[PDB]
Design a protein around this ligand. Structure first.
Ligand SMILES: Nc1ncnc2c1ncn2[C@@H]1O[C@H](COP(=O)(O)OP(=O)(O)O)[C@@H](O)[C@H]1O
Ligand code: BEF
Ligand SMILES: [Zn+2]
Ligand SMILES: [Zn+2]
Lengths: 337, 343, 366, 369, 369
DNA sequence: GCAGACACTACGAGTACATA
DNA sequence: TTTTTTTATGTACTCGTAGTGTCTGC
């Protein structure tokens, strides 16, 4: 399945990062600020391959030593992974505590040690705090790797004890060329997907590979039906899913582009769908458009943040409040200081 | 399989004991009464030695099978009793019951006590093997409407005079708690052996030890009975039920009401109810609600519901119990202030 | 120890005859009629509010069942076993604090002691206190014993939380539920003990003690003992009022009373008193918001008042009837905004005071 | 109260402490019931241990200056103190206030006691039967009727053992609802007929205290109490209230078909056939013909044990199902060499008895073929 | 080619297989973790079991001609497939695709396997130090200081033993910050100075591995793990990264006050005093005077215990309070005739050692109330 | 011994409750 | 006439199992 799919835009950075470890002066803790699915996992995996290799050469693992074989097999006494438990999107303090207690003993293979957390943004406060000191002063030859959507989203204490590497996304033309090579579809839709993925080619490619593109097309059609009539409730049929935050973000981008079109911005995030954005711009006043956009993004943040929240109630209430906002003579929310 | 109610058991027991008796219901009182009657009749007909067992992954089944296959030195007639788990007979338990039915003998009388049987549970072959010759007793708690008739019938059986007021008080104070209702009937009969019970006599020795379910609260909201809904809500809070259960139970119905009110502008409720598998009593209650609720009231109800959900889930606050009274007073007939619905 | 006054009123004034228990007629009459008419159950389970008489009434039942002058509601108190039950220990009355013996390894021994014939009395009497804390396996053992109880044993279980017991135990026990004592009954009893203890008293102090008792007679007796302590052997109105003010915890309700009354000095004094007790300020604001929500629900319908707020029912009802809804909504908005702004204040005390000052500015007095 | 004193040797004290420890030490119903009651009277020491239904009292001779006082000292602590002292060292004991002082060679302890007024004691009871018996007879009666005793049955009367006094004969009866065991022996004296139920703890302590030496065990039975004297050990207990079932009915009073065999051969054959029985439905089937008997067992493997020509029989063909555990237990407890086994019917009780004596009898109920 | 010809006899592997299994696959942590590796080399079959921390290898001698290689199989399946075979069995294991076929007469069974490349295992490594230890020597070394390990303490470096080798001497040091135990034994072998910190679990598993003076033990210590070869069994446990404290600076520097007593007398006295000591604070206060040791204790119930011992004491009168458990443990470990105690100050630690042999030392740190 | 018996102590599991 | 519950971590409690100290007639 999904594995170390190396990406070209990681080449300038990887060769740099291994250098920081080749001289032996590298930081034990490297927090990667990379967009999801952009390639942070593959880069961290390759770095760990270099680190745990007993007889490495240049900028790649030998693939012959027993450390390389064990790493390939997925089992290694000196390669700990911290990933959310199956069916739960969080990293418990118990796993971090077990890993930290295991770090006390020496490395079995006589080499170094690697502790890789799949996503530091999913750390529970207790787990991140249990990892604080382990991050600060690890034992001899211990290496930590962290990945995050946003470093500032992490705990203000954990992020302090870590060298932060930022993976710059490729320029839009390079990304669209890469995805055109990977996917044979229209340029407009490809650019729209890249802008939707905040310029990250990996996320746009994953969006096209999955059914998310069909869902986006269905949501665009539902919006086209609902904008002139105000039948926003039907949007529920397209909005309620296990990937609801992504579709809410798509709606937010559409509202972004409607406000841009009213202001006349040269480029828009949704370039593949001009009819819907034009309909939104002409039908809805900017004053109510801003309120709808703010409420949609607030609902998205609430849905992402608090675990166990019910998607049905939140999405239905968002749609009903949007329909209420559409009616004239209704006060609008104002951002709170 | 003769399916009966506890009213008709006596005659059946006088007709002759059956190989197996399945006491199935959600009501402890009727189950216990049927079990006591069965055991009394069996003791009258020679069944002297009584054995009781609890079904459990910790049950020493081999002992049960040996007892069913071993004769006793005294009182060869034996009665076997089992207590079904809250989940009913599991697949392994179904096989165990099939093996027990295989060893069923004329001299052995079997009694089963537990919750209701779900369709899959009696689908298992052992149920039919028993049903070839057995009796099943449905001890289901009477609903709100059927309670006064049952209370009056038991009062006439117990030889005490109840008026309408005392019956209403007993129904209002003991709903879903028929065990406590019979305890109260015994208490009132023993307190005043005159046999005449009225409002002043019964208003003293009756407490509000009712047992409710979230469905009762939702149906009270649907029918528009605000006082009954508040009573159910307070009783459920005192019981300690999780408020998220109430939130989900109300949310399902409220979303259905919102969808049907949206669709009522094009299609009558008669077809709309048949579209989404709404039952007859539910059809009547839902039609009454949809006729007595507008769009604005439903929208405000959903707004208050999502505010309560956000308070419960991300703030871990303890104001959900007080806030649910907001929905209770908003749905029935009374619009509520804006600040209490959004903020 | 030294001097007879050491006897705690919660212990010395333990009822000894059915004529001494007060306010529990609906159970006393039932027990008397059952004992006299021969009607009897295998087990009797008592329940109700704390300090109402469940254990005392259970001990009275144990006295009545085991008097050689016949099974009767009223024991003589002269013979050997009647005194042995109260003074000293009686062999055939087995008193088990279930909280101390939750594990099944003790209930197993207890039910191994049920097959033995009673020594003195006819009925082997078991009194198990706080039966709602027994373990699940102990509950299974107790149910097994209760399924076929020998004719010479009758159980007595006393508890405060009946909801925790297995339904199969409730099914075989004729539960007696004891209602919380009324204010008048508590006051009359307190007057009775105070007059019969040669302790001076004043009626307003007795009314205050009864109101502060929250319905439990043990609370009233303890506050009476403290009132006698606070002073020189005299229950004075001033001493009782000062003690209750020291122990009072309804700062939020009196504070909203003063706020709606627009009495700024009263609100400030109440905030001072709450500060003296170290009251959590955010908890105070939360409780005030709850009170305002409840009073609004009362305004919408009088059914919003349940049995959970029976102590403050009259005050909330009268403050609902006299105050228009608009003032309630404005005060709720002001207090919610103030709680939102409370953490970002110089300190919690000044923040909550500033919120109250904001609320008082609406519809002020001359 | 105060002034009470001991001066006792460890050898003369250790064994009675072990005897009186019994069930004490665990969490008691009352805090006092963890303390041995120590008493002095007429120059002898009395140790008392109580369980609200038991009382074990040990008497120790005193030949040292002392004082007739009483106290209650924790059983575990006092026994540990008396055990940890050097061998042959004398313990000197006194009381002061609420502190009991123990002294040995350059060693002093203070222990917290409780007043003797609060110690429970078994109420005085008028005896109905007096009895004297050698230890060997009582041990034989108990050992041959303890295995077939009910275990935690919901029926109270089946718990414990039944004592029968009939003429010049003492009888012990045990029943678990499927098995019955009766062992009856002469005693050399005539007694009024009496039926008395003794609990499981009572028979356990009766069996434990029995000694291998010659001793006239002096039993004393009242309306609802039992007491036994073994030298200086006096053990009393309550009686299990109830109605033990009549043993004279279920036994094969008038049998017809019977078998004669050797106990060892039947034990070996039953053990061999035990492996031929599944754990569920764990039983055997005895198929008996003229001087023939095979033992099988229901099992998916479908095996058999076949030794027909090693038994005596004077009847017709029968096939009767037993439980292997019950027959194994009764054969092992019988311990004799020649065994008689009366087969009244295929659906009636079956008797197992000593073919060379009449001291014991056992009744086993077949289980549905 | 899929050769994998294993030709072994069952009874010669069941005990090794149970040994190497030990904590066999019961943890769902990793599918490969719950497996055992079969390897052929040096004319012998190596059975390897490892859970990424502890590795155990049994080197069983082969019977018939073999075919070298390695493959891993489910441990529980192999354990159960050879534990029920009647007496001996000619276990013939063959490779078919990804399968082991086990044959013995008319008994053919299958076990799905995994390649040995996936199984984590340790190859040859340069040992930092090598020991040829008699079994009795290491048994005494670990036994006399195993009670001094820290049981899951915050200081992670104290969670094990310090094996310090110096010259021709091997020392073990174990402490938890309250007690300390040092045991040094000669080896007659010039060995480089080294320090090892073996965890608690590793030393416990090593201790329950060696027995019988007939098979000398071979210890190989590297920079990251320790291996022990007892006969044909090999154990491997990782080391602790911490640094053990300098024990020679923990022992008192100037123990002016000397005491000598009998080991049995001290042990009996300490147990006797601990009978009435506090339940969770088992500490005695000890006074030394001229040829006299007074040990006293009490509990919250104020049941004081006091004893006096005739000792050979050199020094001034002194008071020191220390816990009883550590000193009873030290006295039990020192299976000697005379115990020598070193005391410096009423606030200083106490040294305990054998008076007749300078081979062990213990430090007890007193209680400051 | 001794091993069984018994005593005792520890670990896991299942359940219940509290908190944010 | 069948329908409804959020998490993460920790703290007790009560029971069977499980492994081991120890020691008494075996
Ligand atoms: N109904 C009552 N009548 C008289 N005294 C009472 C009553 N209820 C409580 N008390 C007083 O409180 C003391 C303790 O009462 P108790 O019955 O033990 O309360 P609980 O219900 O909490 O077990 C009694 O000694 C008595 O003084
Ligand atoms: F105060 Be009671 F005995 F629960
Ligand atoms: Zn490599
Ligand atoms: Zn009397």
């Amino acid at each position: 399945g999904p594995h170390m799919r190396w990406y070209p835009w990681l080449r300038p950075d990887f060769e740099k990062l291994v250098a920081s470890y080749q001289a032996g002066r590298g930081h034990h803790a490297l927090l990667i600020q990379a967009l999801p699915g952009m390639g942070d996992d593959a880069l961290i995996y390759a770095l760990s391959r270099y680190l745990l290799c007993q007889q490495p050469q240049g900028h790649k693992s030998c693939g012959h030593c027993r450390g390389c074989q064990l790493m390939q097999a997925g089992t290694h006494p000196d390669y700990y992974t911290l990933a959310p438990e199956k069916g739960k999107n969080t990293l418990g303090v118990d796993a971090v505590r077990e890993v930290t207690e295991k770090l006390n003993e020496h490395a079995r293979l006589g080499g170094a040690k690697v502790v890789w957390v799949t996503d530091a943004a999913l750390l529970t406060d207790a787990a991140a705090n249990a990892l604080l000191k382990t991050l600060e002063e690890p034992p001899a030859e211990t290496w930590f790797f962290l990945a995050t959507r946003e470093p500032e989203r992490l705990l203000a204490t954990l992020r302090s004890r870590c060298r932060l590497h930022y993976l710059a996304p490729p320029p839009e033309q390079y990304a669209v060329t890469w995805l055109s090579r990977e996917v044979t579809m229209s340029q407009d839709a490809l650019l729209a997907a890249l802008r939707l993925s905040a310029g990250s080619p990996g996320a746009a490619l994953a969006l096209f590979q999955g059914d998310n593109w069909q869902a986006r097309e269905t949501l665009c059609q539902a919006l086209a039906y609902s904008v002139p009539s105000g039948d926003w409730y039907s949007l529920l049929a397209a909005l309620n899913h296990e990937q609801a935050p992504a579709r809410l973000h798509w709606l937010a981008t559409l509202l972004m582009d409607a406000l841009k079109r009213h202001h006349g911005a040269a480029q828009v995030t949704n370039v593949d769908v001009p009819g819907l954005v034009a309909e939104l711009a002409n039908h809805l006043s900017p004053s109510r458009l801003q309120a709808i956009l703010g409420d949609v993004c607030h609902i998205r943040e609430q849905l992402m943040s608090v675990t166990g929240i019910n998607r049905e109630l939140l999405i239905t209430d968002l749609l009903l409040r949007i329909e209420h906002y559409l009616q004239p003579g209704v006060v609008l929310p104002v951002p709170h200081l | 399989m003769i399916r009966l109610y506890p009213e008709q058991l006596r005659a059946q027991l006088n007709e002759g004991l059956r190989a197996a008796y399945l006491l199935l219901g959600n009501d402890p009182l009727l189950l216990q009464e049927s079990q006591d009657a069965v055991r009394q009749v069996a003791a009258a007909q020679g069944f002297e030695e009584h054995h009781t067992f609890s079904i459990d992954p910790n049950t020493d089944w081999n002992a049960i099978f040996s007892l069913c296959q071993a004769m006793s030195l005294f009182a060869s007639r034996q009665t076997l009793l089992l207590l079904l788990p809250e989940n009913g007979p599991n697949a392994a338990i179904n096989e165990q019951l099939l093996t027990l039915t295989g060893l069923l003998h004329d001299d052995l009388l079997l009694i089963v006590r537990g919750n209701k049987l779900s369709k899959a549970q009696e689908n298992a072959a052992w149920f039919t093997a028993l049903a070839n010759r057995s009796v099943q007793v449905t001890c289901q708690t009477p609903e709100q409407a059927q309670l006064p008739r049952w209370v009056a019938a038991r009062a006439k059986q117990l030889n005490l005079e109840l008026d309408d007021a005392a019956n209403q008080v007993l129904c209002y104070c003991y709903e879903g708690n028929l065990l406590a209702l019979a305890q109260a009937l015994e208490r009132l009969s023993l307190l005043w052996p005159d046999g005449k019970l009225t409002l002043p006599r019964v208003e003293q020795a009756v407490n509000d030890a009712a047992h409710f379910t979230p469905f009762h609260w939702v149906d009270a909201l649907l029918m528009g009975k605000s006082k009954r809904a508040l009573h159910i809500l307070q009783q459920l809070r005192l019981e300690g039920s999780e408020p998220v259960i109430l939130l989900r139970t109300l949310q399902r119905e409220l979303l259905l009401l919102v969808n049907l009110k949206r669709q009522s502008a094009h299609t009558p409720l008669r077809a709309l109810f048949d579209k989404h598998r709404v039952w007859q009593n539910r059809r009547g209650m839902m039609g009454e609600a949809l006729n007595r609720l507008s769009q604005t009231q439903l929208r405000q109800a959903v707004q208050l519901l999502t505010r309560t959900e956000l308070t419960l889930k991300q703030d871990y606050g303890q104001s959900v119990w007080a806030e649910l009274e907001g929905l209770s007073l908003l749905l029935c007939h009374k619009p509520l202030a804006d600040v209490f619905i959004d903020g | 120890g030294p001097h007879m006054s050491y006897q705690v009123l919660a212990r010395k004034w333990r009822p000894q005859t059915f004529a001494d228990v007060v306010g529990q007629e609906h159970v006393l009459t039932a027990l008397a009629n059952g004992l006299s008419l021969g009607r009897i159950h295998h087990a009797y389970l008592f329940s109700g509010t704390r300090g109402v008489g469940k254990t005392s009434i259970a001990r009275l039942l144990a006295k009545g069942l085991n008097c050689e002058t016949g099974i009767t509601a009223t024991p003589c108190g002269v013979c050997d076993n009647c005194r042995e039950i109260e003074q000293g220990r009686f062999v055939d009355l087995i008193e088990i604090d279930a909280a101390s013996r939750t594990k099944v390894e003790d209930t197993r021994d207890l039910l191994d002691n049920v097959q033995y014939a009673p020594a003195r009395g006819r009925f082997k009497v078991y009194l198990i206190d706080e039966v709602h804390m027994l373990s699940r396996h102990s509950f299974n053992a107790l149910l097994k014993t209760l399924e076929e109880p020998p004719e010479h044993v009758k159980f007595l279980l006393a508890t405060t939380d009946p909801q925790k017991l297995p339904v199969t135990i409730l099914s075989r026990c004729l539960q007696f539920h004891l209602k919380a004592l009324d204010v008048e009954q508590i006051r009359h009893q307190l007057e009775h003990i105070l007059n019969e203890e040669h302790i001076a008293h004043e009626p307003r102090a007795l009314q205050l003690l009864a109101r502060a008792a929250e319905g439990s007679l043990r609370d009233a007796l303890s506050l009476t003992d403290q009132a006698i302590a606070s002073g020189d052997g005299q229950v004075s109105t001033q001493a009782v009022s000062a003690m209750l003010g020291t122990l009072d915890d309804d700062q939020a309700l009196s504070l909203v009373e003063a706020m709606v009354e627009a009495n700024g000095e009263r609100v400030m004094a109440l905030i001072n008193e709450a500060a003296a007790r170290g009251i959590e300020w955010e908890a105070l604001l939360v409780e005030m918001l709850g009170l305002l929500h409840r009073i609004a629900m009362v305004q919408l319908s009088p059914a919003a008042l349940g049995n959970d707020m029976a102590a403050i029912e009259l005050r909330m009802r009268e403050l609902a009837r006299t105050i228009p809804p608009t003032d309630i909504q404005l005060y709720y908005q002001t207090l919610l905004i103030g709680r939102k702004e409370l953490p970002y204040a110089p300190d919690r005390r000044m923040g909550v005071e500033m919120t109250l000052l904001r609320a008082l500015a609406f519809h002020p007095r001359m | 109260g105060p002034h009470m004193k001991f001066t006792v040797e460890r050898e003369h004290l250790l064994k009675p402490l072990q005897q009186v420890s019994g069930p004490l030490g665990g969490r008691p119903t009352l805090p006092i019931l963890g303390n041995l009651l120590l008493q002095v009277a007429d120059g002898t020491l009395s140790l008392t241990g109580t369980d609200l239904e038991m009382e074990m009292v040990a008497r120790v001779a005193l030949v040292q200056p002392h004082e007739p006082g009483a106290t209650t000292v924790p059983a575990r602590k006092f026994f540990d103190i008396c055990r940890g002292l050097p061998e042959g060292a004398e313990i000197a004991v006194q009381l002061e206030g609420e502190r009991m002082l123990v002294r040995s060679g350059r060693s002093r302890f203070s222990l917290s006691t409780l007043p003797a007024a609060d110690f429970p004691n078994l109420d005085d009871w008028q005896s109905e039967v007096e009895f004297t018996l050698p230890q060997a007879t009582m041990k034989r009666l108990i050992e041959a009727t303890q295995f077939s005793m009910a275990h935690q049955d919901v029926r109270y009367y089946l718990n414990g053992m039944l004592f029968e006094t009939e003429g010049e004969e003492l009888r012990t009866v045990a029943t678990d609802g499927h098995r019955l065991a009766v062992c009856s022996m002469p005693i050399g004296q005539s007694l009024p007929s009496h039926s008395v139920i003794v609990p499981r703890k009572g028979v356990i302590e009766l069996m434990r205290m029995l000694d291998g030496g010659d001793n006239p065990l002096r039993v004393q039975i009242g309306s609802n109490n039992i007491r036994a004297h073994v030298g200086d050990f006096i053990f009393t207990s309550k009686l299990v209230d109830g109605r033990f079932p009549d043993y004279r009915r279920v036994l094969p009073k008038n049998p017809d078909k019977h078998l004669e065999a050797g106990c060892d051969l039947l034990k070996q054959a039953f053990a061999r056939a035990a492996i031929l029985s599944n754990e569920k439905f764990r039983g055997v089937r005895l198929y008996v013909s003229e001087n023939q008997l095979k033992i099988t067992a229901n099992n998916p493997e479908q095996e058999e044990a076949e030794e027909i020509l090693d038994v005596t029989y004077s009847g017709a063909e029968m096939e009767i199902g037993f439980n292997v555990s019950y027959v194994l237990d009764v054969l092992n407890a019988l311990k004799c060499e020649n065994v008689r086994m009366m087969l009244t019917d295929s659906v009636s009780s079956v008797q197992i008895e000593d073919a060379a004596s009449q001291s014991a009898a056992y009744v086993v109920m077949p289980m549905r073929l």
